[PDB]
Amino acid sequence: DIVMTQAAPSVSVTPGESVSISCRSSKSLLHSNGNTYLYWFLQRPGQSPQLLIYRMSNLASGVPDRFSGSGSGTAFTLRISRVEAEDVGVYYCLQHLEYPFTFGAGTKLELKRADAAPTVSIFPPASVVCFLNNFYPKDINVKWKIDGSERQNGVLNSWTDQDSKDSTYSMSSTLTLTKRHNSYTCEATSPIVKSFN
Amino acid sequence: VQLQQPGAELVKPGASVKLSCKASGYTFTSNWINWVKQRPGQGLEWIGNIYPDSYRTNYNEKFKRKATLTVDTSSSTAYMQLSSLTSDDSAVYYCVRKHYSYDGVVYWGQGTLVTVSAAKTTAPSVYPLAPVVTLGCLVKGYFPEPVTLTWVHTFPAVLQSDLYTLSSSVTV
């Protein structure tokens, strides 16, 4: 079994700058015919994988020359030139020199951007939902309060992956209740707050 | 170049399932058809392939007694049968085409999400979410995944007791 290792589960880079992603194989991928059987795929948020680089460093149709590949025989590197917001996703290497074909564990690319505050929207009913959109960084908290009382139970949150246009993150928070109170408020991490009656 | 695959398949544990991949927009017998597994939030795994021209097959040992690849050349359709499913079998399965000769020609289908459980189908129950600008939509109480939504930010489905709840927002 040829093992493929991508040691970094993720890597952070500032837009406009460059970054490289490593992949190592337990057996050389170079063949007698003089060709290296290594593939690099990118899987964007919510999409199926797609070819990026084949053989040494051949670029797939439509791939910006900003990408390029290199590497010895068991050591390979995928390098992206001037990282753009649209580059967010997980990069996978793959050998097809020997059966069974095998994938690297994948490396998530993350973008470092300017701090940003969330745009909050609250929506009444039998559940109350709140959106904390386009903020940065990813680590943000939400607080719920009913008639001033800070409710905790009955909340389920959900985050999106880094935005491909602006690199911000967004979150949704739902407060579910028994289909006898007046002030419903949603606030983040002066504070950013939204309520209704 | 097209590889159509059904959105999902709810399967009862112990039972088997047969997944389809309809090719179109290229010479079917000229490309190998590969199948790949991806568990929700995890990496990728090669299951096996088949070359429609000769009917030759290759199987990852791990799935030798689990999958069976067949191709119907008269319908440009490829198939993969998965036998006696367990919970571990719940994942998205992609058929992928790769030219027998040219190397830079690899193309991935949209994938089929297989859900292995005894539970029963349940359509959603969409909802409003109008400003007490940003409009919302609350798709609640469906099963299994996935659901489609178009008009933004459509958030990952959340599981609330054998039921998935999702929401999306629109900002004009």
Ligand SMILES: O=C(O)CCCC(=O)N[C@H](Cc1ccccc1)P(=O)(O)OCC(=O)NCCc1ccccc1
């Ligand atoms: O050389 C051997 O003994 C066979 C090695 C496997 C093989 O035939 N690979 C072929 C290339 C090759 C040819 C000659 C020598 C080495 C490699 P191949 O890459 O065309 O294999 C056919 C195939 O179905 N490849 C799919 C690879 C792939 C898997 C998953 C997602 C995307 C792509």
